[PDB]
Design a protein around this ligand. Sequence first.
Ligand SMILES: [Mg+2]
Ligand SMILES: [Zn+2]
Ligand SMILES: [Zn+2]
Ligand SMILES: [Zn+2]
Ligand SMILES: [Zn+2]
Lengths: 257, 49, 64, 44, 117, 528, 39, 48, 477
Amino acid sequence: PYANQPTVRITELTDENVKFIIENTDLAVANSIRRVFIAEVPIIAIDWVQIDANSSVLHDEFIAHRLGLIPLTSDDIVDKLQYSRDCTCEEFCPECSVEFTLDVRCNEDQTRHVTSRDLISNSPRVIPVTSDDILIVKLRKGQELRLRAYAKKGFGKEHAKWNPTAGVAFEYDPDNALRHTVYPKPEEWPKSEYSELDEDESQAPYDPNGKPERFYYNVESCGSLRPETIVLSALSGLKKKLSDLQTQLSHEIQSDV
Amino acid sequence: RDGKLAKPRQLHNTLWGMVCPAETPEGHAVGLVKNLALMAYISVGSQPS
Amino acid sequence: MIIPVRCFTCGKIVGNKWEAYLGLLQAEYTEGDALDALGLKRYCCRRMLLAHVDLIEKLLNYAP
Amino acid sequence: MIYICGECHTENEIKSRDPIRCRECGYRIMYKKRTKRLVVFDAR
Amino acid sequence: MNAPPAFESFLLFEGEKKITINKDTKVPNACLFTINKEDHTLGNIIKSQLLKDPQVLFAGYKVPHPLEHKIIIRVQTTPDYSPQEAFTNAITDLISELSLLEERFRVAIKDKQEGIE
Amino acid sequence: SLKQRLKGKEGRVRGNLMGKRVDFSARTVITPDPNLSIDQVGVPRSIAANMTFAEIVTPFNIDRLQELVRRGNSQYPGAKYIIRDNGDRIDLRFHPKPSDLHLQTGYKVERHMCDGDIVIFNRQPTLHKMSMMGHRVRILPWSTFRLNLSVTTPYNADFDGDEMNLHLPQSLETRAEIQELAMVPRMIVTPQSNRPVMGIVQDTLTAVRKFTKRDVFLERGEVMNLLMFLSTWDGKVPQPAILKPRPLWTGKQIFSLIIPGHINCIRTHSTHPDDEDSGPYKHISPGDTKVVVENGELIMGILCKKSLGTSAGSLVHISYLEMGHDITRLFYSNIQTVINNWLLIEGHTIGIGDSIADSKTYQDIQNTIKKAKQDVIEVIEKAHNNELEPTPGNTLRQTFENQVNRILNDARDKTGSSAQKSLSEYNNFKSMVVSGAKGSKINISQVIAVVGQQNVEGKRIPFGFKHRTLPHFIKDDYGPESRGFVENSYLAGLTPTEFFFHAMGGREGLIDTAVKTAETGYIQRRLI
Amino acid sequence: SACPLRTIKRVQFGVLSPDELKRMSVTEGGIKYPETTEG
Amino acid sequence: YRHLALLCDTMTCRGHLMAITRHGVNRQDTGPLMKCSFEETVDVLMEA
Amino acid sequence: KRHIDQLKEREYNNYSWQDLVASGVVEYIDTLEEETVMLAMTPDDLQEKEVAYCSTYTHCEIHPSMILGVCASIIPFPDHNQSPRNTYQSAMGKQAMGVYITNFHVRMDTLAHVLYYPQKPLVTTRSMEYLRFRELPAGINSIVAIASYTGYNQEDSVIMNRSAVDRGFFRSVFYRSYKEQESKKGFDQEEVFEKPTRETCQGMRHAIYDKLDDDGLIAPGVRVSGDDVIIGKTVTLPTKRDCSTFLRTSETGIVDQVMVTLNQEGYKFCKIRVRSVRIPQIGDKFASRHGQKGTCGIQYRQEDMPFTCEGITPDIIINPHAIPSRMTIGHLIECLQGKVSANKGEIGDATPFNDAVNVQKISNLLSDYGYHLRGNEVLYNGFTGRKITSQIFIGPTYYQRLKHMVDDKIHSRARGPIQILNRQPMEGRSRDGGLRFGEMERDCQIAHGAAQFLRERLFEASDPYQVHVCNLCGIMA
Ligand SMILES: [Mg+2]
Ligand SMILES: [Zn+2]
Ligand SMILES: [Zn+2]
Ligand SMILES: [Zn+2]
Ligand SMILES: [Zn+2]
């Protein structure tokens, strides 16, 4: 009637993906942390744009949208920023925001690319991912653009611009030892990357008293957080949800009298 | 646009290669408006002199 | 009209790979090899570049 | 207020109840200049 | 505006309370918890833990409507045990499992500061 | 002139006396919702915050109503008028200070439409009295009407850009009348043909057939998860059918909890071999047929459209005749919810592996078609050498076309049976055809074996060109392929000349439907 | 308002005589001038 | 069956075959305010 | 052959179609003349000496694929579909959003739709290079799976990925223009653009007239919502009685640009364009290239859609029951052919009577692409991570976004404005009048036996009234 002792084992580690393996756990826990890499990891992104002069080809709400999806370096200072709805300041302050600024004017005849190298911030900790360049708009001789933006903090249930990860692979039981899925003709199916079968076999023999273990992960990253702090910030975020719900519960069955 | 006579609405075989056989609207104007095929060319006229 | 900044399905960043893609097709590469030299290996992220029509280069012909 | 010609893009203040023509271009299609009160958007 | 804002899915209002207890009157030793502003991420993590208790007879959960944010959990235990007991004993076993896995992970990433090979 | 002022349709006698334009009505799109009872409807919050209902003030509801009138037109559950005894209709989205307003016995508040109200819901053309049933309101976030699926059969609806109207009774006599007369659980059986109009539909039907097979065993966790969705469960877990390694329950053992009361019924499944009642195993049924529901529990048999659909003597019909109109509602709802929440474990699909066959089948179909063409050539040549003898009441050309039709139909049918014969138990076409959810046996053979023979005006493709059908055949060609016989399948694709004849057949089949609607509508209006 | 309320049970047709036409009309003597307003 | 019986009974009730048509409904012992709802209001009501 | 190797050089040779007719190798053939002719469909196959059909062929066709119109020659493999299906799409690709003309910035059209990210097909017919469908395309190649997932894609519906809509999938814009013209209808009755002030003008309502400038027009850039005034036009009274133009209800646009000039008879007039962005939601209508229209049922996030063994979630999920009844097998080959084209790097060919690719040849290639030849794949469940017992048919296809959106079809009435003469419900400024209670609806209620509801809908819900009647006589009093 108690918990398990899971064991982790990392296989790869780059600046854009992690491959690891979690043995000796339950399927519901190995999935509930697959949905947290996506939804509930906080990150910085632009959420307030105001345009002073836009004489380009794209209308105002086109450029205000291509800006929010630019990823900003959210490595270390996400833990020091309040949610703008919790902070005791006014609409904006340097405790819950970061201000950007763009101002470009095309004068030569050759066309001009307005990349993300033009987003100039005030805090040297949060800059777009440049240390190529994302394209925002192209300008012709006689056109210009200038605006001001603030970058708040949130996670991926608000909007899909706040999630920190590209595709998150996940799979278990590379051979149908459990027959969770049923092949009609088990010979036409390619063998999985993690399989341990022979070259002339299709499935492992069925065993009825089995249970799914040894889940395989592969977490990529878009560029904001390192691929190994996406995981550490997820487990530390899921733990703090249960730990807060246990407060509300004991506060209920205590006020029962 | 509402006459129930079918013979001005059904597909003639002579329409081979000069009017598209599949493209037509539904409703009450079935087979009354038609679009012409890709290489079909309409003549302009000349003098028999 | 302009290359999207993120693949619609994965979320992988694509908006910085359009000029490099034209540069590889420029020399001799086939579309199948240029997409592999960039690191697009899922067929949802290859559809992004393979089927993109660039209309922004034709709206820059009208004087402002 | 202030209007923008449709051909030469030279701003020229047109007074109330006055003919609609440019200057230095002689043109009869005018576009009103963008406002100066500011509106804010969401990247969402 | 006929579309709800995005923060309504996780942000609690002023009058609402996150958890609510009601006793089921059809069978003895049954209870019915109603967590508010929640979804499958938390609903499923609990049910799997209750079934691992050898003193729990029933355990399940449902999201009554996918367009509202609320789940329901039903528990039934043996006559010498309390549903409120089995519930809180489940949570403290998840926390003891996650905090353990975090230690074993942070060790594995610094197990290759320079590299094992 | 004056007699000109009161003309017929759109005059003053036929356009504004019996047919007019009303208020307290709304209109928008409909979308499915399997989580609603068959007597509920889903209303957006922008429509509900617009239509009102006048509620008389009595000392039983004075506090609630003055609370509602505190918040007006800003909060949703509010009010927007107060009608006092004098007829004074004051407007409260503006009154400077609301707190001075003190409701009094006899006054009449104009409430906002809340949950639990009663409405009337109809679809575009109203043909029979089932095209306007009384639903019950339940308010949901987004902006479409939401209603259950088993009720789409009476309305004859489908969710590809359809629309439906609702009207809100304002009087209490009108509300009461609908509640005890035209509510949707009261119109399950129709007096037109004395049989149910609402049955289980496509999706749930395919899954119900698979859920009640002889070999469907459930573990403990899954049984608990399924029982969580029963609204009429007493609270006891039945003893499993197999009590050793793990307790395993069966599909029929869980379905026996949905069936209400203690009803009795005997039906058959759509694959019952007619030669089974003859020999032994009449009460054993190796194929698990002959549904038997004894004392309110499924003992044996697979469920399908013959036993759950809208037909006479079905299970829903018997449950309506014996138990009443308020238990069949729960029957429908429980079936739907339980079967959907098992289907997301079992899954269902359709691909192209389910549209392909073994090589032998391809080899055999070609042979039958080659022989069919040989017979048509013999008949034609024999007729030219004048060796055919007309039958009584037939001309030589009519009897030659009789020989030709006979041969063509027979060839097509034999091929179709061969194609039908080669399928597997895992096939997904056979899974929708057998359970009766969607499709027919002919579509299987048309997809796999042979499209068949086209025909316009009920006869073979005519010689549109002079003595030809297309400018690519020779003159007076009477063969099978030259006059409409498509010998390919939809998987192997058609050749151009066959694609044209198929288009012709489709076109005539498309015109007839366009005529039928207007014709039938007008004749019914006259008769009524 | 002070008066009661009641149903209809029968509708009888017929032509009306010039007698009641003159007796129940509202503009005594009759309308004489083809012009409606003057100032 | 009741529907067929009722229809074919009300269709042959007045002795002769009156079609359910324009001038088949035009003839019965019906009121004046029903024949005014069918395309000849003024003349039949002047008769009335 | 001498005519071909010098016809592939028209760019710097000045040899073209006209020099081909004038050399006696092609010829125009009328319909009447087409009854005295003997045609062959294809040279290499019908003009070979054998025991032959005919031997006196007089003409030959160029390609038998030129018997189709313009809207029907964008369908891949139409020689595989049932006939009525090809009729529906040809009347349905005429209302698919795309980019309609390159200079859409200048034209102040009314009701213009424009897609953000159009894409050209991955499976093309060879007769699309001549009608410019790869320079002004209308659609996006989406990854479609044919499976039953949770019941929200029954009866012609689709489930679609929510976190792909957030990356630009099928996003579009929507423009609309309004005209106003100042006019001198009389010697004294004269109109003029100006900002109406409350104490001078009189026939105003309760609108906020602060957005208007001194001219009487709104500067571009502001965010005009429903029931705002945009043009202030005052009429002089024989003092000043103002008119104006208000928006429709529920626009929430942004004023794009304002133009001022002189129309034909010389009266000053202005045009105003309003911009509004439309994100796909759960009422919108989507259609394939083979006559399968359908609305959107629900939107799941990426953490909930079913995935493959390398993390490829589908963008759209459609019901398998749509195929067997209408027999669109051309829909099942272009998603098999499309999966080979993305893995090899070419662009496929779907010319109808070329019929070059056998499905199996394409199918085999997919296993070669490590994506099972059956077009089938093994999908995992997204909620519980378990495998799905069946294998799901998945691949890329080309979908279009039709014009019928749900923001335009919702309306409601509850005690709204009525008319003046007959006191019957009338439409108001909020676009929303009542729904007609026709004759056939008056009969379902009679058969139901509901006498109160039939009275409410016709008398209490439409023009109630009271009169006074005498007792001895039956005349009003
Ligand atoms: Mg429909
Ligand atoms: Zn701040
Ligand atoms: Zn991707
Ligand atoms: Zn000028
Ligand atoms: Zn009197």
